[PDB]
């Protein structure tokens, strides 16, 4: 109905699900994938 | 001379023309306009020093010149703010011949600096006399045009700006002609034509000045063309920053979220105007409107003086959208009680919006009541939360979030309640809804015997419209890891499960480097692979990333007791016990 | 969000940014003079030469 688009337009979402999982700092995964490959070097 | 002046007509072979004029000085430097034609070339190469070097040689000799060598003298003195010499040159030009146009229009532009001071002599003596001695001069036509604009004579500006366009043929002049016709039809709201004028004004001579760029950018607010408004307004900041050019990019906020190319510049403009006050009213509104992603206290402060700023120009009550949002801020703060007061007075002000179904104060009250019911949940006043939720759903049953927060409330009581059924009917009203659909399997997390069955109930919206869903695919990883610590790893079954969870974790690794629950999963599965020296490091990363993940506290101390580092472990166990969750969590003391 | 007016129009106006601009004189690209060695049929170099006080203070580049 008009109420649905009427509300979901005017509000805002600053807090979702997905960026909870993502960290507020910058933690890249190269270090993570480097040790991922390093344990594979033990394999 | 004939071939050198042949070159200036076409805009090329210009240094060639200068060379053939300097061929004159090495054959016959016996008169000055041979070398003055060098100096106009030098002037048009923006070398006013090289112009005036030969121009000193003009007035020492002064050949027969009714064309007033002093006119170009003053125009070079117009350059680089040698104005007092420009005035004296145009004056002696007028004394030799008052009929000449260039001196009077030069002083006209020279006193275009002061408009509130010496208005009349600019308007009539400096301009209308030039119009009298030549009514076809596109300079004086342009200047009476912009004067008539400011004198609010919007008729004869369009009489003579067309001629000011046609009579000139150089780009910047007809750029200004199109720009002035554009500002004429802009205040006359004939914006379709004036848009074309603004674009032509930009396209003719662009490096001249930036008002046509501003005209196009604000014209892109017409007709929804605002994508080019940002791009065109960027050159206004490339021109020079001003208070003006903040608000255009601030209101034209393509910055929605995680888009810093419009958001960092928004921050810069907002702290370009926050210290200022060009009657700042909404400046705090669009301050805080990006601050809700950022620090919340900045948004609080913006709303604080924004509450005031609506009271002094007129004692006007704050619109309830502001007050609802500041209560929403205090919801994530400790200021829960006055957040409730904000929602109450928000609903009252929406009631004070008695006739505003255009603005739909009723819908604003709907979402305000949603926020207030969410607040009553924070009070643990689930009774009144039920009341507000059923009030909204009995009047807007199409809404889903109220339909499931009710379900979440009964989930706090338990799973097979109408919790699970509100959740399923939320999919019945909206099967496209990924949040509720995730919450369906979230219910099924309670039934871990429904472990391998969760492939199906987390496949339903693995339709790629919903994909990518990091939350759900990490849920797949988690239901895949709870399979572990079984005596079937030696049977290669949990080894395959470990590597499958590893594959999920690699997938979420590549699509997101900055997820932390992922890295927790990788460290967990490799710790189950017996690499505990290889685990405290990867958990250390998410440890600085955020300490406020209850899982990593446990998983680090598991490593510690695996080195038998109890005196490093149990303290962090009770640190995990510092959350307000459960006085005796069982597995933690286990 | 706030229901902002679409600011498709100027009333402040930009006139602070407008009259600060000093406008070029490009009526004739060789700077408003016909460049000719034939139309000087006359010459002040003959007795007597003429040079106004304004003309000497324009014969200087920058001496103030």
Curated annotation (Swiss-Prot), chain A:
Spans annotated as Interaction with CTNNB1: 1-33
Sections of the chain in a coiled coil: none
Tissue and organ expression note: Found in adrenal and parathyroid glands, kidney and heart.
Post-translational modification: Phosphorylated. Dephosphorylated by PTPN11.
UniProt subcellular location: Nucleus
Domain of life: Eukaryota
Function: Tumor suppressor probably involved in transcriptional and post-transcriptional control pathways. May be involved in cell cycle progression through the regulation of cyclin D1/PRAD1 expression. Component of the PAF1 complex (PAF1C) which has multiple functions during transcription by RNA polymerase II and is implicated in regulation of development and maintenance of embryonic stem cell pluripotency.
Pathological condition linked to this protein in its record: Hyperparathyroidism 1: An autosomal dominant disorder characterized by hypercalcemia, elevated parathyroid hormone (PTH) levels, and uniglandular or multiglandular parathyroid hyperplasia, adenomas, and carcinomas. Hyperparathyroidism 2 with jaw tumors: An autosomal dominant neoplasia syndrome characterized by primary hyperparathyroidism, ossifying fibroma of the maxilla and/or mandible, renal tumor, and uterine tumors. It is associated with increased risk of parathyroid cancer.
Subunit record text: Component of the PAF1 complex, which consists of CDC73, PAF1, LEO1, CTR9, RTF1 and SKIC8. The PAF1 complex interacts with PHF5A. Within the PAF1 complex interacts directly with PHF5A. Interacts with POLR2A, CPSF1, CPSF4, CSTF2, KMT2A/MLL1 and CTNNB1. Interacts with a Set1-like complex that has histone methyltransferase activity and methylates histone H3. Found in a complex with BCL9L or BCL9, CDC73, CTNNB1 and PYGO1 indicative for the participation in a nuclear Wnt signaling complex. Interacts with PTPN11. Interacts with SETD5.
Family: Belongs to the CDC73 family.
Protein name: Parafibromin
Source organism per UniProt: Homo sapiens (Human)
Protein encoded by which gene: CDC73
Residues of the full protein shown: 218 to 260 of 531
UniProtKB/Swiss-Prot annotation, chain B:
Compartments in which it is found: Nucleus speckle
GO annotation, biological process: blastocyst growth; blastocyst hatching; cell surface receptor signaling pathway via JAK-STAT; cellular response to lipopolysaccharide; endodermal cell fate commitment; inner cell mass cell differentiation; interleukin-6-mediated signaling pathway; negative regulation of gene expression, epigenetic
Signal peptide: none
Coiled-coil intervals: none
Keyword entries, A-Z: Nucleus, Phosphoprotein, Repeat, TPR repeat, Transcription, Transcription regulation, Wnt signaling pathway
Record's subunit section: Component of the PAF1 complex, which consists of CDC73, PAF1, LEO1, CTR9, RTF1 and SKIC8. The PAF1 complex interacts with PHF5A. Interacts with KMT2A/MLL1. Interacts with STAT3. Interacts with SETD5. Interacts with ERCC6.
Protein name: RNA polymerase-associated protein CTR9 homolog
Shown part of the complete sequence: 132 to 721 of 1173
From Swiss-Prot, chain C:
Location in the cell: Nucleus
Superkingdom to which the source organism belongs: Eukaryota
Function: Component of the PAF1 complex (PAF1C) which has multiple functions during transcription by RNA polymerase II and is implicated in regulation of development and maintenance of embryonic stem cell pluripotency. PAF1C associates with RNA polymerase II through interaction with POLR2A CTD non-phosphorylated and 'Ser-2'- and 'Ser-5'-phosphorylated forms and is involved in transcriptional elongation, acting both independently and synergistically with TCEA1 and in cooperation with the DSIF complex and HTATSF1. PAF1C is required for transcription of Hox and Wnt target genes.
Known partners and oligomeric status: Component of the PAF1 complex, which consists of CDC73, PAF1, LEO1, CTR9, RTF1 and SKIC8. The PAF1 complex interacts with PHF5A. Interacts with POLR2A, TCEA1, SKIC3, KMT2A/MLL1, SUPT5H, RNF20 and RNF40. Interacts with UBE2E1. Interacts with PINT87aa which is encoded by the circular form of the long non-coding RNA LINC-PINT; the interaction enhances the binding of the PAF1 complex to target gene promoters and may anchor the complex on target gene promoters, sequentially pausing RNA polymerase II-induced mRNA elongation.
Family from the record: Belongs to the PAF1 family.
Protein name, entry field: RNA polymerase II-associated factor 1 homolog
Organism of origin: Homo sapiens
Range covered out of full length: 50 to 113 of 531
